[PDB]
A = this chain, B = another copy of it.
């Protein structure tokens, strides 16, 4: 019992046809958004308004209604807010009034009429024509997170704070393309279906092309095709697009997410550090009007210049172990054991250094920080640091304790690039099933010559989380991937 009123709504549908109305509407032209009427006419008195007879036409979903007698009111909601309509049978006539009376919460209508103020003072529209636009067969639920994510639409109608996050997300990506376009980076589109899933260390989604009878992998990264565009002489390219990773959900991961990948010939990772803080600072200024923002319990300062800290120096500062020292893989393992860092059988010194960083340091980096110099074994596409080849000129950007970007001075030496892949294939033998695969095609492109280049990848959803103060990626995705 209770939802039996579903029969009541179903009933109200045929009655509307009997009134001779299309219960699902026709086009309806409007003159204004609810918020505009307030902004334009909110300060005119009841008298100045009857005086000016402003005609307007608006449409929206009925959120509240109080009829009775031969006149009633209702609050109608458009994407900008609600506006009260006053409907009297003496104005709209018998027929349209019956339509108003039979109208229910959830139903969508359009009206033409004049701006007016009741004796209570609430700006309203004194209706001259009432148009039924669409019958809601179910009532809007009673004002869980299951529903907000599984039925985003109800969340968007009932929770203004949620709809603004999505509008800001739009502004953020728009702001991003604007900066990137004005700085000469060419926007491009590369394949999301790959012969070989490469460009990152991740598990791919596998699919099949019936006609070509070929196995394809949804891309886990945009990197290798953008490098082919740098060999192509395109110099500055970027792509803000979807990438897919066959991994579980979390407050920071969605299997399909949005990544910005960007390449710039003749720059190195220090140049990309400057670009990354400037871009982001550009975006926060443009959308929030300030680079000082609040995220959860933190006051995060996005004002460039951001802190630069070598991964090894970070481990020294936050744990006290000094990996600058040349040591054997076993000594690294002993250290791991002593400090509670979990390590896998395919791991050697380099991987272990990164585990110390991930497991004991990461969550402590609240202010924007470029952690750089990642060990060569976890950076198969980055160029080795000329002074200490155990590390590469790579950096990751951390803020509020989490990874927001990855970037590097690109490895453009095909011989060295082929060896990194051989090293990865070996690791896969020892069980690292996220190790990159061989991609002969990519190697042959490199062999035609790729100029020294600086590359960058930003998790766009995570940046949006940060700039809208969303605790979870599920809050910045219209339709997050649900379990079950």
Give A residues with C-beta under 8 Å from B: 22-30, 59-61, 77-79, 106-108, 110, 133-138, 140, 151-157, 163, 166-167, 170, 173-174, 177, 181, 186-193, 203, 205-212, 214, 216, 218, 225, 228-229, 231-235, 241-242, 244, 246-249, 255-256, 258, 265-268, 270-271, 383, 386, 409, 412-415, 444-445, 447-452, 454, 477-479, 481, 483-484
Contacts and interface: CB of A to CB of B under 8 A. Distances in A.
B267 A27 contact: yes
Contacts of A206: 207-208
A177 B233 CA distance: 27
Contacts of A449: 61, 106-108, 134-138
Contact of A447 (B107, B138, B190): B138
Output the residue of A22, A189, A479 with the most chain B CB within 10 A. Answer: A189
A193 B255 contact: yes
Given A211-B247, A242-B242, A23 B413 contact: yes
A451 B133 contact: yes
Contact of A78 (B192, B235, B445): B235
A18 B67 CA distance: 92
A299 to B, nearest CB: 29
Nearest to A191: B479
Top 9 nearest A-B pairs (CB, nearest first) are A136-B449, A156-B232, A25-B452, A153-B232, A211-B248, A27-B268, A205-B207, A207-B207, A153-B231
Contact of A212 (B157, B211, B386, B484): B484
A174 B191 contact: no
Nearest to A61: B233
A36 to B, nearest CB: 12
B61 A163 contact: no
A77 B110 CA distance: 61
Contacts of A448: 106, 136-138, 140, 153-154, 157
A475 to B, nearest CB: 14
A244 to B, nearest CB: 7
21 contacts: A24-B412, A27-B454, A28-B266, A59-B265, A59-B451, A60-B233, A77-B233, A108-B451, A153-B228, A153-B231, A153-B233, A153-B445, A156-B229, A157-B233, A166-B188, A177-B177, A205-B209, A206-B208, A212-B483, A225-B479, A228-B479
Nearest to A153: B232
Output the residue of A134, A152, A181 with the most chain B CB within 10 A. Answer: A134
B193 A481 contact: yes
Given A207-B206, A483-B212, A59 B192 contact: no
A480 to B, nearest CB: 9
A268 B451 contact: no
A267 B187 CA distance: 32
B136 A447 contact: yes
Given A174-B187, A448-B136, A451-B59, A246 B211 contact: yes
Given A170-B187, A207-B218, A234-B163, A192 B228 contact: no
A216 to B, nearest CB: 7
